[PDB]
Amino acid sequence: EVQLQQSGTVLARPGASVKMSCKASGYTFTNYWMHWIKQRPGQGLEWIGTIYPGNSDTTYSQKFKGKAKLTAVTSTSTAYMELSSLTNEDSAVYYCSRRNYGSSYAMDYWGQGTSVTVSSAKTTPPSVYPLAPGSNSMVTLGCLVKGYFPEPVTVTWNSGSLSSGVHTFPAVLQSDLYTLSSSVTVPSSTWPSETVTCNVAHPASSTKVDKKIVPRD
Amino acid sequence: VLMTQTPLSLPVSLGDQASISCRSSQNIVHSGYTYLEWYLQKPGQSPKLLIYTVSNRFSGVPDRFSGSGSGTDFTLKISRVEAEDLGVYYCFRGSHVPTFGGGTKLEIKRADAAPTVSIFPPSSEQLTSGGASVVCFLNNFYPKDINVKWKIDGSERQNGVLNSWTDQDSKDSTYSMSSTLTLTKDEYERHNSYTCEATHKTSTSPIVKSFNRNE
């Protein structure tokens, strides 16, 4: 089983530098090229560069030479990428991938990506508010997640045991503060006869918030 | 040497075929071996391999996908599109200066559907902090074009609204929207009726859901 684990979210201020990792397992780390891709909303996928863990030979995209730095440590099967002189345009999600050969000739295994936010705004834990109907055969509930920074934030209901009829909306930035929502539709025969809880995780601030939705009035 | 994809957006009904083009400004074809691949990235997931070396299909990939091409033009075909095929497709050159095409956003054409509207008053916890936000969900509707009009005691409101749209549903190919009207606790206390109105192509009469702060 081949796996590529990348490091978590990172918040850096303009002009500073960041360094993310890509830990590989399930194969001989030194025999394959590792690639890095940039993903910025409204810009599609962009090729940064590549490295051969075996001898650390590299090749960078003309556009990224002097912006990105690739390195590797074979004793831990971990590849790293460094970004310096950060600007706003550097905010995006970065992935790493393995170039295969033999059975296939392409990038077959990818990492889960790493989010990078370049801003001088302060970090703020999310405020999670329950949404219960005021006053059918199916009921819709929700959770309002306001005032957090930076993104992202993950949401689940009943810790995941509840996945059907869920709608989690994209986070919108409004003056250094994000906002998102999430609805969930369930049978009237299960609420409030049973419990429904939205779980909100904000890794960027190392916090977790749970909110039980209970009938109003 | 850059990769030109076409089209930028590609609407296609269910059961229909779809064709995406990719043109390498300069030959990269040694028919030997030609390193042209197609990758897919669905919202919330990492990109994934579909086809490598022009026509070779990757494991666990439906046979509805196929690649071909010669010289400077390569093509990706999707025979009989299905709800789960939506996302962004990218062609990639693996040889000299690996480069990504601009990508193509595949979207599904389907029957019209009216939105399910639900409205919710501010939570008590938010009220305590001195704020008051009114949330309104308009879920599983089609087409995507839609408008939300807020009403405070009958009169329209326009300043202080925040809207967000989910990506097309990968099961029923519908869209959903969330609209939040944020007011100060004082501003919210000076009024009683709050209405969330939705005007959609499935009617000339808007769908309305509201409540009174006096229950």
Spatial distance between the Cα atoms of B66 and B70, rounded to a whole number of angstroms: 14
Are A116 and A133 in the same domain? no
The answer to whether the CB atoms of B180 and A104 lie below 8 A apart is no
E strand or H helix that includes residue B161:
strand B161-165
To the nearest whole angstrom, how far is the Cα of B103 from the nearest Cα of chain A?
A: 7
Residues A44 and A97 placed together within one structural domain of the fold:
yes
Do residues A107 and A148 both lie within one domain? no
What's the number of CA atoms in the CB half-sphere (13 Å) around residue A210? Answer: 8
Q: Which residue bears the tokens 């202080």?
A: B160
Q: Residue B187 belongs to what H/E stretch?
A: helix B185-189
Positive/negative CA dihedral, A186, A188, A194, A199: positive
Assess whether A104 and A13 both reside in one domain.
yes
For residues A204 and A181, membership in a common domain is answered with yes
Q: Chain A to chain B, count of Cβ pairs less than 8 Å apart?
A: 133
Last residue in a domain, options A76, A101, A120: A120
Domain count of the fold of chain A: 2
Contact flag B46-A113 (C-beta cutoff 8 Å): yes
Q: Scanning every residue of chain B, which has its alpha carbon at the shortest distance from the alpha carbon of A46?
A: B100
Q: Residue B99: its chain A contacts at CB < 8 A?
A: 47
Domain check: are A34 and A68 in the same one?
yes
Q: What are the structural domains of chain B?
A: 1-110 (no CATH), 112-211 (2.60.40.10)
Query: Looking at the complex, does the CB of residue A113 fall below 8 Å from at least one CB of chain B?
Result: yes
CATH assignment at residue A159: 2.60.40.10
Please list the residues that pair with A57 across neighbouring strands.
A52
- Do both A79 and A49 map to the same domain? yes
* Residues A95 and A185 reside in one and the same domain: no
Closest residue, chain B, to A131 (C-alpha): B120
Residue appearing with tokens 């990172």:
A10
Please report, for residues A9, B169, B213, the alpha-carbon distance to residue B157 in angstroms, rounded to integers and kept in the order given.
Answer: 37, 30, 17
A100 in the same domain as A157: no
Strand partners, B24: B3
- Which residues lie across from A6 on neighbouring strands? A22
Cα distance between residue B19 and residue B10, in whole Å: 9
Least CB–CB distance from B215: residue in A110, A134, A174: A134
Strand partners, B18: B78
B100/A46 Cβ within 8 A: yes
Give yes or no: residues A143 and A52 share one domain.
no
Contacts of A168 in chain B (CB under 8 A): 166
Residues A32 and A58 in one domain: yes
Task: State which residues form the domain around A135.
Answer: 121-215
**Interface probe with B: pick from A173, A180, A181, most Cβ of B within 10 Å:** A181
**Contact between B91 and B2 (Cβ < 8 Å):** no
Method of structure determination: X-ray
Resolution of this model in Å is 2.7
Which tokens hold the place of A26?
Answer: 């399930």
Concatenated DSSP letters of A172-213: EE-SS-EEEEEEEEEEGGGTTTS--EEEEEEGGGTEEEEEE-
Q: Domain end: A94, A120, A146, which one? A: A120
CB contact under 8 A, A105 and B47: no
In 3D space, the residue among A39, A36, A26 whose CA is nearest the CA of residue A99 turns out to be A36
Q: Are A144 and B180 within 8 A, CB to CB?
A: yes
Would an 8 Å CB–CB cutoff place A179 in contact with chain B? yes
Please check whether residue A129 touches B, CB under 8 A. Answer: yes
Q: Which residues of B touch A113 (CB under 8 A)?
A: 46
Q: Residue A154's closest chain B neighbor by CA?
A: B44
Core vs surface per residue B157-194: b (16+ CB within 10 A) or e: beeeebebebbbbeeebbbbbbbbbbbeeeebeebeeb
Cβ-nearest to A217 among B163, B166, B215: B215
How many whole angstroms separate alpha carbon A42 and alpha carbon B165?
Answer: 16
Cβ distance B102 to A44 less than 8 Å, yes or no, reads yes
Give the end of a domain, one of A64, A94, A120: A120
Residue with tokens 């807020």: B150
| Pair (A137, A101) in one structural domain | no
Chain B: closest CA distance from residue A166 (Å): 10
Q: How far apart are CA A25 and CA A4, in angstroms?
A: 7
